[PDB]
Swiss-Prot record:
The gene is Sptbn1. It comes from the Eukaryota. Interacts with ANK2. Interacts with CPNE4 (via VWFA domain). Like erythrocyte spectrin, the spectrin-like proteins are capable to form dimers which can further associate to tetramers. Interacts with CAMSAP1. Can form heterodimers with SPTAN1. Belongs to the spectrin family. Fodrin, which seems to be involved in secretion, interacts with calmodulin in a calcium-dependent manner and is thus candidate for the calcium-dependent movement of the cytoskeleton at the membrane. Plays a critical role in central nervous system development and function. It is found in: Cytoplasm, Cytoskeleton; Endomembrane system; Cytoplasm, Myofibril, Sarcomere, M line; Cytoplasm, Cytosol. Residues 1-106 form the PH domain. This is Spectrin beta chain, non-erythrocytic 1. Isoform 2 is present in brain, heart, kidney and liver (at protein level).
Length: 106
């Protein structure tokens, strides 16, 4: 269960709603109550640190759907039980549903 996803940090740096609000295209790799953020399938395979926190916890993750987030259509609000809050944009409903279903299995 790996693939590319658009990631927007709602809260990621203590302050009210983070210091940045960028829409970063990252490669998400699902793991047992964890998720890895890499550059691509090759970066995830070799284990290259694409960011600071690469192996994030997906333990007791809460997920909500955002079918109309301004200019973004198939988006979902994913909040980890680690304080971290992110918005994930998929390419289609089938992908979004598969992502949420996989995350819900953690």
């Amino acid at each position: 269960m790996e693939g590319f996803l658009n990631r927007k940090h709602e809260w990621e740096a203590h302050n009210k709603k983070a210091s940045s609000r960028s829409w970063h295209n990252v490669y998400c790799v699902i793991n047992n109550q964890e998720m890895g953020f890499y550059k691509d399938a090759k970066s995830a395979a070799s284990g290259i640190p694409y960011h600071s926190e690469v192996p994030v916890s997906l333990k007791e993750a809460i997920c909500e759907v955002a079918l109309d987030y301004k200019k973004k259509k198939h988006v979902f609000k994913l909040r980890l039980s680690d304080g971290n809050e992110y918005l994930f944009q998929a390419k289609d409903d089938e992908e979004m549903n598969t992502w949420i279903q996989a995350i819900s299995s953690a």
